Design an enzyme around this catalytic site. Structure first.
Site, mmCIF file in Angstrom:
data_model
loop_
_atom_site.group_PDB
_atom_site.id
_atom_site.type_symbol
_atom_site.label_atom_id
_atom_site.label_comp_id
_atom_site.label_asym_id
_atom_site.label_seq_id
_atom_site.Cartn_x
_atom_site.Cartn_y
_atom_site.Cartn_z
ATOM 1 N N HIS A 1 0.797 -1.221 0.000
ATOM 2 C CA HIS A 1 0.000 0.000 0.000
ATOM 3 C C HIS A 1 0.842 1.289 0.000
ATOM 4 O O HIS A 1 0.255 2.367 -0.065
ATOM 5 C CB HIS A 1 -1.070 0.024 1.115
ATOM 6 C CG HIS A 1 -0.561 0.177 2.521
ATOM 7 N ND1 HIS A 1 -0.182 1.412 3.028
ATOM 8 C CD2 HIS A 1 -0.478 -0.738 3.515
ATOM 9 C CE1 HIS A 1 0.168 1.200 4.288
ATOM 10 N NE2 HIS A 1 0.010 -0.077 4.628
ATOM 11 N N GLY B 1 2.447 6.032 10.151
ATOM 12 C CA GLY B 1 3.860 5.930 9.814
ATOM 13 C C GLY B 1 4.521 4.669 10.352
ATOM 14 O O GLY B 1 5.664 4.366 10.004
ATOM 15 N N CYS C 1 3.531 1.588 9.681
ATOM 16 C CA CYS C 1 3.379 0.560 8.642
ATOM 17 C C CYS C 1 4.736 0.086 8.142
ATOM 18 O O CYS C 1 5.624 0.907 7.881
ATOM 19 C CB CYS C 1 2.502 1.052 7.495
ATOM 20 S SG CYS C 1 0.781 1.417 7.955
HETATM 21 C C1 LIG Z 1 -6.519 4.249 9.974
HETATM 22 N N1 LIG Z 1 -6.768 5.253 8.943
HETATM 23 C C2 LIG Z 1 -8.058 5.926 9.030
HETATM 24 C C3 LIG Z 1 -5.906 5.583 7.948
HETATM 25 O O1 LIG Z 1 -5.669 6.747 7.675
HETATM 26 N N2 LIG Z 1 -5.362 4.542 7.246
HETATM 27 C C4 LIG Z 1 -6.158 3.898 6.195
HETATM 28 C C5 LIG Z 1 -5.548 2.587 5.749
HETATM 29 C C6 LIG Z 1 -6.306 1.728 4.955
HETATM 30 C C7 LIG Z 1 -5.792 0.525 4.505
HETATM 31 C C8 LIG Z 1 -4.512 0.173 4.860
HETATM 32 CL CL1 LIG Z 1 -3.890 -1.382 4.372
HETATM 33 C C9 LIG Z 1 -3.723 1.003 5.633
HETATM 34 C C10 LIG Z 1 -4.235 2.220 6.089
HETATM 35 C C11 LIG Z 1 -3.364 3.150 6.915
HETATM 36 C C12 LIG Z 1 -3.299 2.627 8.350
HETATM 37 O O2 LIG Z 1 -4.178 1.911 8.824
HETATM 38 N N3 LIG Z 1 -2.256 3.104 9.071
HETATM 39 C C13 LIG Z 1 -2.040 3.001 10.459
HETATM 40 C C14 LIG Z 1 -1.451 1.903 11.084
HETATM 41 N N4 LIG Z 1 -1.317 1.753 12.409
HETATM 42 C C15 LIG Z 1 -1.772 2.727 13.186
HETATM 43 C C16 LIG Z 1 -2.391 3.907 12.703
HETATM 44 C C17 LIG Z 1 -2.877 4.932 13.553
HETATM 45 C C18 LIG Z 1 -3.451 6.054 13.027
HETATM 46 C C19 LIG Z 1 -3.569 6.211 11.652
HETATM 47 C C20 LIG Z 1 -3.123 5.242 10.800
HETATM 48 C C21 LIG Z 1 -2.523 4.056 11.296
HETATM 49 C C22 LIG Z 1 -3.934 4.569 6.924
#
Ligand SMILES: CN(C)C(=O)N1Cc2ccc(Cl)cc2[C@H](C(=O)Nc2cncc3ccccc23)C1
Ligand SMILES: CN(C)C(=O)N1Cc2ccc(Cl)cc2[C@H](C(=O)Nc2cncc3ccccc23)C1
Ligand SMILES: [Cl-]
Lengths: 298, 302
Positions: free
Chosen positions: A41, A136, A138
């Site tokens: 991603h 960040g 990821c």
């Molecule tokens: C969670 N969120 C609303 C996002 O902006 N996301 C959408 C999203 C969708 C699909 C996939 Cl595979 C990855 C993501 C991203 C994601 O999950 N990264 C994050 C990982 N761990 C903690 C995170 C805390 C806070 C933000 C983002 C985190 C980014």
């Protein structure tokens, strides 16, 4: 004496953490030999379509203050593999292993290719991990160390709406019924890792905490009827065998310890604690208990 | 999201762990530049520990009485000196893996990571706090002596603790890297007991703010308290007095959540009175006190 949630020493893994940038997205990568592994991603979905439009120079890989040059790129399931011109001189002896729910591992949380913390956790029976991750993170990895071999078992990809985390093995296959897409996804009802709770009760006995012990025993079938009622994972004969060394060391048969757990589930702790905890801990496997209570080194 | 007990990555410290042997005693040492630091009780026999004269025992030693092993390589001791309860062994090689470091003495309530070692080899890393009674609730076996406590801020490792002994209650005592013990403890097998332990109040309040930042509000209430009334109640639960310094320290978290420190103090007073009633806060059924206000901001904001 003492019992702590303990992670493996992270040094062998810290030497592999790099920063991967593609467009506006910046996350972490794992540099092993001449390949950098990271969540697919980072290119964001039709991943084959998005990846075909990318060239090697679209990925900026940074190892400390040094830029690595990408000479190839390929996809394997949900992981992106970036071929680099330089083999990582700090590459440890390693394996890629897929773990089972209930198994524990250490996570080296990273941001911008820089490790910021290390914690221990378990792959929940619903395939999520209850981690501590921000945007960040990821690409941060989960591992175990056996002798001098690092077994990489997890790569972080996303956070679910309940605050729990989802990711893949290092071959890009997700743990759990998740997809790497911004869509409505939910973790299933979680259960307690029974063999791990029993291992932690043996660790409590080794540390001198015996109040919960009783004269009773139980059949494996009667305990499993109780476990099902309290959202505890079924205990198999394999689990009973695995608890054998701890059973021999404390002189408390596994089904004898099961009768303590059955009483704790129907009656509670009654104001008491076990290893400083008011809840039954399930993120220590039987091997973690032996390793910590005998001082195994790396 | 999420809140975990998190240790610092241990790599910079792993590259400093060595094995120190003197006679029959083998423990861990910290190799920084051309000096190896270790507890001075490595020069003792188990029959010397009751009342040892370390100046007398050390004067009888020569450089070749200390065997220092860094991995599979033997280091050559070219000097030895004592500073308080730490032995400093001068070696003929500077550690090429020496990180940017400092020696810092910490105060009770402060947290740090421990790299538990045996025979100069790291076996695990965990997070803990200096208790108000100056002990640490660690996880240590015989041979762990010389294992160190640290924090990493930027690329600088601040060494704050060196393990020396286990007290009869299973808790641990040690020194800063200048050899000064934390608490009223001495490196002798004489009868020693840790004072009554108390809860680190400022740390519990920091953890309640972390719970609010992660969306947990069930424990909040419409009440406030005076700092004096809070302390009169808290003392009855064996909680450390909360000072105006602590109130100031909680200021950023108070501003970020919109809950005044004395307002959060009233929630804590209520929680002590009622218990949790089957509920948890950040996955815990007890009030957590091993996260400082600085840890909460670092983990929740970066
Ligand atoms: C969670 N969120 C609303 C996002 O902006 N996301 C959408 C999203 C969708 C699909 C996939 Cl595979 C990855 C993501 C991203 C994601 O999950 N990264 C994050 C990982 N761990 C903690 C995170 C805390 C806070 C933000 C983002 C985190 C980014
Ligand atoms: C506690 N005890 C009777 C001992 O064997 N000791 C006596 C003693 C006295 C003074 C000093 Cl400065 C050091 C020691 C030693 C000591 O505390 N080492 C240990 C450290 N940490 C965890 C330990 C778990 C178990 C055993 C020993 C541990 C050795
Ligand atoms: Cl401090």
């Amino acid at each position: 004496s003492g019992f702590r949630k303990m992670a493996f020493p992270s040094g062998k893994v810290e030497g592999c953490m790099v920063q991967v940038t593609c467009g506006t997205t910046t996350l972490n990568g794992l540099w092993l030999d001449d390949v950098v592994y990271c969540p697919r991603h980072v290119i964001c979905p039709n991943y084959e379509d998005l990846l075909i439009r990318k060239s090697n120079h679209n990925f900026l890989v940074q190892a400390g203050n040094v830029q690595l040059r990408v000479i190839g790129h390929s996809m394997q399931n949900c992981v992106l593999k970036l071929k680099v011109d330089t083999a990582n001189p700090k590459t440890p002896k390693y394996k890629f292993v897929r773990i089972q729910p209930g198994q524990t591992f250490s996570v080296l949380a990273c941001y911008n290719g820089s490790p910021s913390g290390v914690y221990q956790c378990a792959m929940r029976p619903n395939f999520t991990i209850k981690g501590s991750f921000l945007n960040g993170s990821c690409g941060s990895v989960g591992f175990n160390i056996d002798y001098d071999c690092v077994s990489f078992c997890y790569m972080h990809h996303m956070e679910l709406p309940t605050g729990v985390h989802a990711g893949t093995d290092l071959e890009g296959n997700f743990y759990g019924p998740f997809v790497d897409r911004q869509t409505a996804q939910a973790a299933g009802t979680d259960t307690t890792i029974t063999v791990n709770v029993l291992a932690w009760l043996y660790a409590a006995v080794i540390n001198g905490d015996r109040w919960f012990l009783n004269r009773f025993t139980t059949t494996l079938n009667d305990f499993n009827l109780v476990a099902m009622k309290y959202n505890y994972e079924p205990l198999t004969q394999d689990h009973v065998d695995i608890l054998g060394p701890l059973s021999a060391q404390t002189g408390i048969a596994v089904l004898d310890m099961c009768a303590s757990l059955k009483e704790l589930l129907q009656n509670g702790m009654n104001g008491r604690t076990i290893l400083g905890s008011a809840l039954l801990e399930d993120e220590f496997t039987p091997f973690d208990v032996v390793r910590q209570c005998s001082g195994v080194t790396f």
